[PDB]
Design a protein around this ligand. Structure first.
Ligand SMILES: COc1cc([C@@H](CO)NC(=O)[C@@H](C)N2Cc3ccc(-c4nc(NC5CCOCC5)ncc4Cl)cc3C2=O)ccn1
Length: 335
């Protein structure tokens, strides 16, 4: 086989000339020369079968990315998977190679307002399509927003995505979650299972604020410190906001805090475009029924240079040893 850093990367002879890019809980990621398309690609080695939550993420992502086709959503070009079942300890998922992501971008580069308007356009354009397929990303953050050299943007990682279930969204107070903390909407910590499209809109709003200043807007250090941060900017909720929270533990927690006033966006963001902040206001709305939707955000005057509904496509149709077999069965179309 081929090798990277004391690690097998057995991607056949179709992919040669590996360069390590990175690593994490998922596994390891290289660039590799594709000898049939004659372009370097990203390949990531997912070794998920040690625990069932990772096998869920690998099946969810594979199923979604093979069904989705959209310019602002990363796809799957190949899956390299050992030709028999027992020989399958890893899945190698092959995708277009991108230069950077927005996480690394924000840590080193000031963005101009025209780059912020454009990245926001492309995130919502892709989200419009995700939501039109009745799916929720449920983990939008800068590191899941990939970029090539000309600033075209693609959303990645669909392993935490779910089908929307607005009718079964309600739950108790401080009930645990799995979207990333700085981008978790307040209702998650209070009374939401995160099964409505509005959860994504909150995270896009957080990413927008972060592009305006290069700093995370709500930089919590733990689960309940996150809501302190959100209320520190948004203020105490209104009586109407409170009364939509029927759950008494979450209602009485909020009643229990001292009054906090709304920090005006233009003092928090003095160099920001005013249309940008009006949109940010509407994406970081405390009440998720009041929160702006994706088709509405796209039609926001901030994005009027790009807004074209007819060029903003929707989906053709909306949505353990057996996970290990279903991952096997789903990835056979590449042999
Ligand atoms: C976390 O436990 C998991 C997770 C998964 C699965 C499904 O949920 N999740 C992933 O695999 C996520 C976390 N990842 C990791 C990754 C790494 C690189 C690239 C990539 N990177 C680039 N380019 C770089 C950009 C920065 O700057 C250097 C170049 N280009 C193209 C691509 Cl696909 C994409 C991904 C991606 O989607 C499955 C099982 N258990």
């Amino acid at each position: 086989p081929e090798m990277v850093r004391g690690q097998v990367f057995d991607v056949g002879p179709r992919y040669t000339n590996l360069s390590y890019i990175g690593e994490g809980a998922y596994g390891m990621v290289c660039s590799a020369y594709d000898n049939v398309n004659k372009v370097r690609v990203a390949i990531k080695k997912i070794s998920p079968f040690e625990h069932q939550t990772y096998c869920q993420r690998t099946l969810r992502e594979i199923k979604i990315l093979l069904r989705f086709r959209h310019e602002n959503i990363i796809g799957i070009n190949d899956i390299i998977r050992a030709p028999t079942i027992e020989q399958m300890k890893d899945v190698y998922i092959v995708q277009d190679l991108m230069e950077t992501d927005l996480y690394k971008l924000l840590k080193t580069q000031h963005l101009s307002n025209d780059h912020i308007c454009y990245f926001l356009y492309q995130i919502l354009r892709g989200l419009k399509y995700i939501h039109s397929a009745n799916v929720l990303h449920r983990d939008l953050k800068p590191s899941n927003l990939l970029l090539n050299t000309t600033c075209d943007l693609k959303i990645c990682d669909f392993g935490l995505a779910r089908v929307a279930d607005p009718d079964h969204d309600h739950t108790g107070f401080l009930t645990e979650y799995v979207a990333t903390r700085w981008y978790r909407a307040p209702e998650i910590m209070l009374n939401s299972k995160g099964y409505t499209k509005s959860i994504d809109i909150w995270s896009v709003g957080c990413i927008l604020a972060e592009m305006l200043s290069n700093r995370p807007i709500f930089p919590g250090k733990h689960y309940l410190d996150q809501l302190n941060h959100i209320l520190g900017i948004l203020g105490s909720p209104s009586q109407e906001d409170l009364n939509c929270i029927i759950n008494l533990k979450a209602r009485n927690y909020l009643l229990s805090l001292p009054h906090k006033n709304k920090v005006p966006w233009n003092r928090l963001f003095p160099n920001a475009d005013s249309k940008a902040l009006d949109l940010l206001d509407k994406m970081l709305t405390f009440n998720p029924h009041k929160r702006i939707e994706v088709e509405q955000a796209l039609a926001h005057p901030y994005l009027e240079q790009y807004y074209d509904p007819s060029d903003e496509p929707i989906a053709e149709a909306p949505f353990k040893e057996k996970l290990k077999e279903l991952i096997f069965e789903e990835t056979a179309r590449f042999q």
